[PDB]
Structure formats: structure tokens, C-alpha cells
Design a protein around this ligand. Structure first.
Ligand SMILES: C[C@H](CCC(=O)NCCC[N+](C)(C)C[C@H](O)CS(=O)(=O)O)[C@H]1CC[C@H]2[C@@H]3[C@H](O)C[C@@H]4C[C@H](O)CC[C@]4(C)[C@H]3C[C@H](O)[C@]12C
Ligand SMILES: Nc1ncnc2c1ncn2[C@@H]1O[C@H](COP(=O)(O)OP(=O)(O)O)[C@@H](O)[C@H]1O
Ligand SMILES: [Mg+2]
Ligand SMILES: [Zn+2]
Ligand SMILES: [Zn+2]
Ligand SMILES: [Zn+2]
Lengths: 396, 400, 186, 186
RNA sequence: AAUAGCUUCUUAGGAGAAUGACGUAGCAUGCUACGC
RNA sequence: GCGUAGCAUGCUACGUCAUUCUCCUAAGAAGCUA
């Protein structure tokens, strides 16, 4: 059967850089219980597999970012890492693609559940997450469509939709090419069979689907975290017209998402060494370390300084718990210590001197309130640059 | 569980258990309070009695800090330290209390029984913090004395308002006036339970008395009336605000010529606006409160509060104010008290009226432009602290 | 760990072991003193473990009571900390306009609405006395927040418009202060 | 622990052993007392460990019972709350017109939105500006969803009242928009 | 005042393993008192 | 040559104590990313 539900809507309270307020939808439990039981197995199996396209649940510490970056270059021919971003991804995704996502995630229970069972499950998910009865400020409303960001299957559904837009742009760019000027004798045949298998046929063609997918994985390697992509496309092709390009993504978003992705936000790096310009909001540098070269992620310094200087609660403003709230900031800001720009070199030692001063004033106040202190010595290991330098090595 | 040394204003974590109010004492201050006075009960974040089961060494001078738990000499842990040592007592912030020589006076105020003029004449002239402490402890002492006298019982049932009372033979009897109310406990065996509050009045003949209870309960022979308790809260605000002068008038706005029949007082009506606080001595039967209402006119829109100690006095003055002011005036005196009755004019709780007439017991905690206490000859340092605490105004004038 | 009981016993046992290995004793007494050494070491070790446990137990309270006291203190007295910090920063800003409006706001002349920005909008600031008046007012220009305003309609406290002539120290004491001035930005 | 049978036997065994050593007999009694105290301390370890296990076991069981009771209490309370809200909600809806339209429906199925749209007795218009005001709910009566309503109270954003006269094209700025105006079916 | 993922810290518990020490039983070897 | 006994030593099993390690659970406080 089906069970409509009500989902609230709350304003968020957190640092940012644009004066718009972002909302989040907290779905009602009677839906999360069932969705959890239905998807948990597949989801906990996606978040624990290293070395595949969908990279969720792979830390950047302990030599994880370097392994991501060296997997992406799965032996493509003339790399040119690119990117993109969808505008208003959460409020324009058409209903059809959300339904395709839910179907592809429900394509595993080929034997746990029967067919009518799968259909009522999908109808239930549609009426609970897709087109629900939002309750925004003491008064119900009706959502026209578009995903919501508080259910169970959110980041994975986004990853699926993302791969779908990428492959669609790829198909369009391969078809639209003239065809009589493609010099090679293989890819032209490939197009000539693609069109026929697309429109002049009705049933699956597993052999050809396999050939096309291998062609992709050899000229369009990806890396996807729910909408943040990085591609490593062969370049001679992409110039002859045989894989995607930012122009093609603009087109596909123009007739399937119904927005316009201006090319001022699609960075395109042409030197393979220096890594992706910006992925998941962490620029990437190449730093020598231990006789071999590794990639390191480093944040945007203004963000670290802001997160130290402005706190959301009044009790977080004293250096009682800060002696701990600062270790984490310093851990995230370590890689700046190998940057060549000097202020990027200093936003580390700032935190590092501040921790020491904090701890010294702490022992002062404590040895005043009583007169003794026994074994709070281990804190002599947070203000040395060795403990953190351990955190970006590959042993563990 | 910290506070300020009532003598040295440092942070301390101790209190005197034997002293009646248990005030915060700096380390050396408590050492001196405990060395030469019989008071030997000092409470830290936990009490200082030896935690050995059945060990009752309670003199702080005979204990030892053990590991986690203090103890007595016989039950002491293997290693520990003496508590009272080198003129100090081990307390939180041990090193950073200053400690002072106000020890003799504090000892006196702590041990005295107030039965001689020394305590009054001394509390009248000591230090402000010490003054307030003496006031609170005197209140609590007289309150505890209230407990000394005895209970009343019934002897014979006659009617609904004519009863014969029986005093517990051998104890001080209470004065039969409206200012005494008692809870009525009836003992079945098996449900010793209160019946309500009661007050008496000696009629034209004994031992018959006419009385009023808050409830219409049927009085049996198994009933009796026990005095109803009262406590004391601590106060912090000053008694007399430090005096200040100026060269202009601020917050108050003059008038041109209104009410010429209040003429001679204008010369003083200005200096009040010039100074922070002042007083008027009015010989018996003089033009006092005439000056009050006259200044109230002189500064019309300046919000004013009147207060006194006597309910009869505040009633008389609120009536006199009703005589000459726009009304447009409230006397929020008492809703359900004041056995001798008073105003039945306006609100008790709205905090809106310009000229608020109130009594110390029922003062709210609001602000105003000027407040005037009256009849200073009766109120005490405590009452002064309350009237300076609850309110806060620009200028203060006392008349008495 | 000197003052502890078993330090002495284990010390004397080790000392006797030394005195016997140096005294050239036999191997049977050597083994029995080895046993004595073992047992003394055992007892001293167990007691040391117990004491160390008591230490690490005390430190929890010693370091939690402090968090509690400090945190309740900070959370309690905040509405004054914010204002004090505000005025400290505002003195340290070292601007002129702010300083003029602040001094004026000190000695009486406070505005009744958001000072505007554009070159045409309303402003209504009170004036409590003639002294401050002639301090600020001049002809038709009423200087405030370091700008140039024009006086529009002086109003008494009884809604009685007055012109600019009557405002004179000798003529002052017959007006019912405080006036209310309106203006316009130049 | 002390109440165990081994306790007294062990204590008196060590005592009488020390007594016999103070008597200084032949070492066979030393061996016998060693054996006695050995087996005594063995069974003593046995029982001590048993009691040590028993403490933790009983305490686990007891905290478990506390948890069970807590869960059942909260569960019953929440069920009562849910039932109460359901019934007090139900006893409100206008049963007459609802019965009418549903029994009119050919199956007992009617899409939800028309349920309020045709049986509600209220209407909470919300207006963001004088213009849309002019063009939706002017005057004292208006028409919407094919029925005739009438104003009864116009509360602004500060939860105050606003007389129907105040809302005028030149009196727009003083009213803190939006303007939650209720109504009543008629 | 949502879903999910990673990571630093603290406490308690459990389990397991190593190590060392104590005690009981059994196994092996030697020396010697006694008995045949 | 055997056994009883004793001593000494090596080995095995068990039962205690302490130190370390490892892992797992639970509970809590703080940070970052979509
Ligand atoms: C072990 C420790 C110090 C050992 C030492 O050798 N000190 C040196 C003594 C200082 N001298 C030398 C200047 C004199 C002593 C000194 C201060 C003592 C605590 C505080 O009072 C209060 C606190 C709250 C309640 O009370 C319950 C526990 C607490 C933790 C107390 C326990 C214990 O009792 C403490 C920790
Ligand atoms: N300037 C005055 N002219 C006439 N009567 C006055 C004047 N000042 C005071 N009084 C009168 O004194 C009388 C009251 O004095 P009272 O208030 O009884 O004395 P006290 O207040 O000192 O105990 C009133 O009739 C009051 O008007
Ligand atoms: Mg008077
Ligand atoms: Zn002191
Ligand atoms: Zn005392
Ligand atoms: Zn004791």
C-alpha cells in the first residue's frame, strides 16, 4: 500500500559565503524506517569498496586522495582533466530522472521481492520523497517535484543522476558528429551501430552495451561524489568531436534539466601534473615527501580562519574545549605548510602557537584553582608538527 | 559552589556551618573565624566531617586530607595532609585570597545574641557588606526566636466564631493580635493534617475568643493551631547609593509657574534635581509630603514612585495624592494582606502607572525617574537594602 | 613512591640480596632470597598500581569540576560581556563620526530614527537644553554625525511649533523643553 | 567473602601455623601448615572470583530491568498522547457538509485538496503588498473559490490589529507587511 | 534544529594475545636417609 | 634392582597478581565534506 507523509523545513545555522539562506527537509520517521530497511545493504556495500567510480566513503587521510587521483588516470591517452557543476541541482532535477534513479537503485532485489512488491515500494518512495506535503511554517504546501535532501537515499541517487547526465552528453556528442569525416574505421562503425541500436530496435543488446561501456571506461574515466565530478577525457578525440565537452554539457542541461550552465564555473585543466583545479572544495598540490611525490588536499585558508574566529555558540569562546576544537582545525590545515605562498605557510603556525598558549593559560588557571597537577603531559604532543605529519602518510 | 569573601571579596569555597547564615569566607578569614570562636563546622564543596563510618570528629582542626576523602586522626589514610596549617585552611583558591583584619567585629556579629544595644550601634557604623550581613543575620535570629514560644489548642466547642483556647502550659504565650496566624493540625492517628490558617482576637471575656480562619472548616476538639514559619532571603544591592553631584539637570524637566501655592519649596525643588540623593527633616506636624506632591507637580511627566514602611502612612499619602493629582494614579499596595485594610482603587500588578505608590513587602522590580521613601525613623538597614534593591531610579529623596 | 609502605620492604629485600651475593653465600639461601625479592616486588607493585588508579581517578574530578564552574560562569553573565566588548571595540575603531554621535548620545541628544544616507530623507533628533542647542545649532545648519542638515520644523514638547528667532537663552526659560528637531541632508 | 566457610578455616590455619612456628617444632609441621594455607587460599581465590562475577552479573541484570521499565513507561505515555490528539482532532471537523459531499461522491473517494476547499469554515489570506491587497480581498466582503466570505479581523505581522481604515495607499509604509487577514464563510 | 561518509579525543566493558611473578597438581632427571 | 621420603632442576596442566599489546562493543564531547 502507500503512505503519504509530511516533511518539515528548517533554516540552517552555519558558516557560508553567500547571503542566501539554505534550508533542509527533515523527513518523517515512518518513512526513514522503511527506506532504511530497504536500501541499507546496497548502501553499506557501496560505501565500503575502494577503487571504483562512485567514490563515497574513501577518506582523504592516510594516503587516500593520492590513491583516488591515481586511479582516475586509468591509462587514458592524452589527458585533460575537466569538471562541471549543475546550478540549482536540488530544485530542477525533473521527476523522470528521480524515478530512473530510484529504479536503478531498486534493480538489485531481483530475488528478495516480487514485481508488485517492487512497484508498491517505488510508488511509496515517490509519494514520500518526490511529491510530498511540505510543511513550511505552520502551513502545509505541495511540492511540484524535484528531490529533497533529508531522506535516506540522497547522495547515492544524486550520484546516479550525475552519471546519467554524463553518459547522455556523451551519446549526444557522438551522434551529432557529421560521420563522413571521422577518419578511423572503428569508431565510425561504432556510431553506425549506435544509432541503429538506439532507434531501429526494441530489445536489449547486451554485447553492444558492453562494447560501448568499455569504450567509455577507456576514454572517459570519471570520479563521482554525488554531484562533484572529475573527468580525464582523452583529448585528440574530444577535439575531433567523439566524446563530451563543456559545450555538450551546456546543451544537455538546456533540454533536460531546463537551466543554463554558464561556462564561468567549468574549470578545465590541461596539465596532468597539478591535478584537478578544485574537487569537493579542496584544491590539490603536488608535494615531495619521502623520495616519492604524492598529492595532498588543502583547504581554502579563509575558510579555516573563519571557522576559528567565528563560533556559533557562546560557550565555545573560551579555551575550555577549544584545546580540542583546535586540533581538528590544525589537522585539516596542515598541508598549507608546504605551499609556496607565505600566508598559506603561516595559517598553520598560527593555530600551532595558539594551541600552546591556550594550554599554558589552562595550567595556570588550574594550578591557581587548586595547587596540584599530575599527568596532563601528553598535550605536549599536539603542538609539534610531527603528529599531524603522521596523518598524511600511507602506512596505516 | 563558589562565592566572594564577605570580608576580603576573594573567591572562596567555604562556609561556616555553626554561624547562622553560613557566609562565604576567604581562607585566612575562615581560619580566624574558627581559631578563637567555638564555631568549628566548616563546609567545603563537601562537608569536613571525617568520612569514616562512626567517626564524628567535627572540629576542623582535627582532620586530615586523605586521598579523595578526608578523615579523623585515628582513621586517617596512610598519607595525607593536615587541613588547618600555617594560619590557613586548605580551600579552593587557597593562595590567591588576601584576607583582612576585620576579624574581631565579625566574630562579635557572629556570636552575639543581639540582646544589648551593641549589635545595633555597631551594625549602624560598620562596613556596607558587613552591614547587610548583620541585617540578614539579625532577621534570621529574630525569626528563630519566633519558634521558641508554643502552640495553641482548643478546649471546648461553642460556636463558629467563639472558641476557648488552651496554651501549652509552661511556654511563652503569643500576643493575640492580627499579626499572628497559625496552621491548624488535627491528629486522628492517622492523618495529622493541616486544616487551614487561623487568626484570633480576644473578645470581651476569657477564655472565649472570636477568630477567623481562611477556610470554613468545622472545628472539632482534636484540632490545634501551630505557628506558621517564615524565612529570610539574602540581599546584595547597596543600602545607600554613593552620593553624586552635577552642574546641570538631566532626566527631569522643569516647569514654568504651575501651582504657585507650592512656591517656597522650588529653591529646594531644584537642588534635588541637581544632586543624586538628598533628605528632608520634617519636624512633627510640618509641611512634609506637601513638598513631595509639590515636586511631583514641578516635574509632571517625571515618573515617580512613593514608598514607606507604615501601611497607614502609605494609605494617608496615597489619599492625599488622590486629593491633588490627576488620577492617573495607582497605589499598588496589597491584594490579599494587610489585616487592617487600605486602598481599593486601582491595579496591584500592571507596571504601567506613572506615580506608583507601594509598600516594601510588595515592591516590584521596575525602573522609574525618581523614587521617594518616607518615614525613615522606623525602617531598618534591611528595609533600606530592599528599597534600594528592587527599584532603580535617577534621583533619590528621603523625608523623615 | 618513597613514603609508601612496601618501598621499604622491597628495598631491604634487594639490599639483602646484594649483601648475600657479595657475602659469598650459598645457592639455597640465594633462591630463598630470590623468593623474598619476588614477593616484596609483588606487594610493592600491587600497591603502586592501586595508588596510580586512585590518581587517575582523582584527575577526572579535578578536570571536570573546572569545566563545569567556568562554563556556567560564562553562560550566566553574558548580556553584560557583549555590551562591554562592544564599547571597547567601538572606542578602538577610532572614527570621527561615530565619536561625535556617541558623545552627543551621552549628554542627551539622541536620534529617533535611523539616520538616512541619501541626500533627501528625514531625521528627528531631540535637544534637551539651550546649552547643547547653541553648542550644535547654527543659523539653519544643524551639524550632527559629521554632516550638514537643515532645520525644518522645531516642535516643543506640547506640539507647539516655534520659529528660530525665539530660541534665545534669555527667552529660553519659557519654552517647555525638550524640543524635537527635524532635518534634511545636504 | 568473609562469610565463606574457607575464610575462618584459613584464618585459624595461618594463626595456628604461626603458633607452631613460635613453638619451633620439626619442619614437617611447616610443610603441613604450608599445605593447609595453600589449599585454603586456593579455595579462597575460587570463592573471591565467584563473588566478583556475581556483583557484575547482578548489576547488569538490575540496570537492564531499569531500562525495560523506562521503555515501557515511555511507550504507554506516547500511545496515550497519540490517541488523545487523534480524537480531539476528529471531534472538530464539520461533520455535516463533509458527510454531504462524500456521500455525494460516487465511490467514497475524493481527492484531498477539495476537502478543505469545500468544507472549511475560515480563510487565512496572506498578502505581501498593498497592490495584491487591492486586487484580491478589497473592502469588507470578497469572493473566492466560488463562495462569499466576509472579513472579521486583519492582524499584521507583529500580531496586532489593524482597523480596515488604516490600510490606505498613502498609509502603506507604517504597516509591517505581510497582512494576515482572516475571514469567515458566509 | 535532516541523510550520509570520514577523522581526532575521552571513559567504561568485553574478548584475545604476549610478558613477568606467586601458589597447587601431574611428568622427567639427579643426590641422599631408610627398607628389602 | 625397587619403593617411601627429602632436596634440587627441567617440562606440562591448573588456579591467582601485575605490565603491555591487539581487536571489538557501548557511551559521550568536537571538526570537516556533499
Ligand atoms: C590529590 C590532590 C593533591 C595532592 C598533594 O600532594 N597536594 C599538596 C598540598 C598543597 N600544599 C603543599 C601547598 C600544602 C588533592 C588536593 C585538592 C584536592 C581536591 C579539591 O580540594 C576539591 C575536589 C572536590 C571534592 O573535594 C572532591 C575531590 C576534590 C578533587 C579534592 C580531592 C583531593 O584531596 C585533591 C585533588
Ligand atoms: N505652605 C503651606 N501652606 C498651608 N499649609 C501647609 C503648607 N505646607 C504644609 N501645610 C499643611 O500642613 C498640614 C499637614 O501637616 P502634616 O503633614 O500633618 O505634618 P507632618 O507631615 O510633619 O507630620 C497640611 O494641612 C498641609 O497643607
Ligand atoms: Mg508625610
Ligand atoms: Zn577575607
Ligand atoms: Zn562561625
Ligand atoms: Zn575518623
Amino acid at each position: 500500500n502507500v503512505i503519504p507523509t509530511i516533511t518539515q523545513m528548517n533554516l540552517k545555522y552555519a558558516i557560508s559565503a553567500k547571503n542566501r539562506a539554505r534550508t533542509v527537509a527533515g523527513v518523517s520517521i515512518c518513512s526513514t524506517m522503511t527506506n532504511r530497511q530497504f536500501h541499507q545493504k546496497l548502501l553499506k556495500s557501496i560505501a565500503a569498496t575502494r577503487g571504483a567510480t562512485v567514490v563515497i566513503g574513501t577518506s582523504k587521510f592516510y594516503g587516500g586522495w593520492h590513491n583516488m587521483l591515481k586511479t582516475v588516470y586509468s591509462d587514458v591517452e592524452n589527458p585533460h582533466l575537466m569538471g562541471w557543476d549543475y546550478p540549482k541541482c536540488d530544485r530542477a532535477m525533473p521527476n523522470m530522472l528521480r524515478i530512473m534513479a530510484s529504479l536503478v537503485l531498486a534493480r538489485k532485489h531481483t530475488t528478495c521481492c516480487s514485481l508488485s512488491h517492487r512497484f508498491y515500494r517505488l510508488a511509496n518512495e515517490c509519494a514520500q520523497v518526490l511529491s510530498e506535503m511540505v510543511m513550511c511554517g505552520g502551513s502545509l504546501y505541495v511540492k511540484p517535484g524535484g528531490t529533497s535532501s533529508g531522506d535516506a537515499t540522497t547522495a547515492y541517487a544524486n550520484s546516479v543522476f550525475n552519471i546519467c547526465q554524463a553518459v547522455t552528453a556523451n551519446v549526444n556528442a557522438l551522434l551529432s558528429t557529421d560521420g563522413n569525416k571521422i577518419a578511423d574505421k572503428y569508431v565510425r562503425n561504432l556510431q553506425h551501430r549506435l544509432y541503429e541500436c538506439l532507434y531501429r530496435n526494441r530489445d536489449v543488446d547486451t554485447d553492444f552495451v558492453n562494447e560501448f561501456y568499455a569504450y567509455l571506461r577507456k576514454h572517459f574515466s570519471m570520479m563521482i561524489l554525488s554531484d562533484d565530478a572529475v573527468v580525464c577525457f582523452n583529448s585528440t578525440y574530444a577535439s575531433q568531436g567523439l566524446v563530451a565537452s563543456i559545450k555538450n554539457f551546456k546543451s544537455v542541461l538546456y533540454y533536460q534539466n531546463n537551466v543554463f550552465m554558464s561556462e564561468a564555473k567549468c574549470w578545465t585543466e590541461t596539465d596532468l601534473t597539478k591535478g584537478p583545479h578544485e574537487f569537493c572544495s579542496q584544491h590539490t598540490m603536488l608535494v615531495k615527501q619521502g623520495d616519492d611525490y604524492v598529492y595532498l588536499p588543502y583547504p581554502d585558508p579563509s575558510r579555516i580562519l573563519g571557522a576559528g574566529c567565528f563560533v556559533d555558540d557562546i560557550v565555545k569562546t573560551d579555551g575550555t574545549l577549544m584545546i580540542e576544537r583546535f586540533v581538528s582545525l590544525a589537522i585539516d590545515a596542515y598541508p598549507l605548510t608546504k605551499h609556496p605562498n607565505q600566508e598559506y605557510a603561516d595559517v598553520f603556525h598560527l593555530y600551532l602557537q595558539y594551541i600552546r598558549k591556550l594550554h599554558d593559560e589552562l595550567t595556570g588557571h588550574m594550578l591557581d584553582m587548586y595547587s596540584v597537577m599530575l599527568t596532563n603531559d601528553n598535550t605536549s604532543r599536539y603542538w609539534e608538527p610531527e603528529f599531524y605529519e603522521a596523518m598524511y602518510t600511507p602506512h596505516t | 559552589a563558589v562565592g566572594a569573601c564577605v570580608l576580603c571579596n576573594s573567591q572562596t569555597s567555604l562556609r561556616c556551618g555553626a554561624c547562622i547564615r553560613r557566609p562565604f569566607l576567604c581562607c585566612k578569614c575562615c581560619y580566624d573565624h574558627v581559631i578563637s570562636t567555638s564555631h568549628k563546622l566548616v563546609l567545603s564543596v563537601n562537608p569536613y566531617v571525617c568520612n569514616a563510618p562512626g567517626c564524628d570528629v567535627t572540629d576542623v582542626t582535627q582532620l586530615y586530607l586523605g586521598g579523595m576523602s578526608y578523615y579523623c586522626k585515628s582513621h586517617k589514610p596512610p598519607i595525607s595532609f593536615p587541613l588547618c596549617a600555617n594560619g590557613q585552611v586548605f580551600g579552593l583558591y587557597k593562595n590567591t585570597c588576601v584576607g583582612s583584619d576585620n576579624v574581631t567585629d565579625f566574630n562579635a556579629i557572629a556570636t552575639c545574641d543581639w540582646t544589648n544595644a551593641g549589635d545595633y550601634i555597631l551594625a549602624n557604623t560598620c562596613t556596607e557588606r558587613l552591614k547587610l550581613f548583620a541585617a540578614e543575620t539579625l532577621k534570621a535570629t529574630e525569626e528563630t526566636f519566633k519558634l521558641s514560644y508554643g502552640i495553641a489548642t482548643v478546649r471546648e466547642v461553642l460556636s463558629d466564631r467563639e472558641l476557648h483556647l488552651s496554651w501549652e502550659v509552661g511556654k511563652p504565650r503569643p500576643p493575640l493580635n492580627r499579626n499572628y496566624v497559625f496552621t491548624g493540625y488535627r491528629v486522628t492517628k492517622n492523618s495529622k493534617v493541616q486544616i487551614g490558617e487561623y487568626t484570633f482576637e480576644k473578645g470581651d471575656y476569657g477564655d472565649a475568643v472570636v477568630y477567623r480562619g481562611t477556610t470554613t472548616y468545622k472545628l472539632n476538639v482534636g484540632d490545634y493551631f501551630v505557628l506558621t514559619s517564615h524565612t529570610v532571603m539574602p540581599l546584595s544591592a547597596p543600602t545607600l547609593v554613593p552620593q553624586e553631584h552635577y552642574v546641570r539637570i538631566t532626566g527631569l524637566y522643569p516647569t514654568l509657574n504651575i501651582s504657585d501655592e507650592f512656591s517656597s519649596n522650588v529653591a529646594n525643588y531644584q537642588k534635588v534635581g541637581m544632586q543624586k540623593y538628598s533628605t528632608l527633616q520634617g519636624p512633627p506636624g510640618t509641611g512634609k509630603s506637601h513638598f513631595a506632591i509639590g515636586l511631583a507637580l514641578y516635574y509632571p511627566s517625571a515618573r515617580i514612585v512613593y514608598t514607606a514602611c507604615s501601611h497607614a502612612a502609605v494609605d494617608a499619602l496615597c489619599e492625599k495624592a488622590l486629593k491633588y493629582l490627576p488620577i492617573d494614579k495607582c497605589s499598588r499596595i496589597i491584594p490579599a494582606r494587610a489585616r487592617v485594610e487600605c486602598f481599593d482603587k486601582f491595579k496591584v500588578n500592571s507596571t504601567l502607572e506613572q506615580y506608583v505608590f507601594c509598600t516594601v513587602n510588595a515592591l516590584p522590580e521596575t525602573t522609574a525617574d525618581i523614587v521617594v521613601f518616607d518615614e525613615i525613623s522606623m525602617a531598618t538597614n534591611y528595609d533600606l537594602s530592599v528599597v534600594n534593591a528592587r527599584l532603580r531610579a535617577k534621583h533619590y529623596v528621603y523625608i523623615g | 613512591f618513597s613514603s609508601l609502605p612496601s618501598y621499604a620492604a622491597f628495598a631491604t629485600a634487594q639490599e639483602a640480596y646484594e649483601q648475600a651475593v657479595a657475602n659469598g653465600d650459598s645457592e639455597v639461601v640465594l633462591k630463598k632470597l630470590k623468593k623474598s625479592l619476588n614477593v616484596a616486588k609483588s606487594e610493592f607493585d600491587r600497591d603502586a598500581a592501586m595508588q596510580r588508579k586512585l590518581e587517575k581517578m582523582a584527575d577526572q574530578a579535578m578536570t571536570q569540576m573546572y569545566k563545569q564552574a567556568r562554563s556556567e560562569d560564562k553562560r550566566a553573565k553574558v548580556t553584560s560581556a557583549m555590551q562591554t566588548m562592544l564599547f571597547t571595540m567601538l572606542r578602538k575603531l577610532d572614527n570621527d563620526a561615530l565619536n561625535n554621535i556617541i558623545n552627543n548620545a551621552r549628554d542627551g541628544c539622541v536620534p529617533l530614527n535611523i539616520i538616512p544616507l541619501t541626500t533627501a530623507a528625514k531625521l528627528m533628533v531631540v535637544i534637551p537644553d539651550y546649552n547643547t542647542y547653541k553648542n550644535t545649532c547654527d543659523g539653519t545648519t544643524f551639524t550632527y554625525a559629521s554632516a550638514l542638515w537643515e532645520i525644518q520644523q522645531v516642535v516643543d514638547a506640547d506640539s507647539k511649533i516655534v520659529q528660530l528667532s525665539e530660541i534665545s537663552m534669555d527667552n529660553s526659560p519659557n519654552l517647555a523643553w525638550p524640543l524635537i528637531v527635524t532635518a534634511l541632508r545636504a
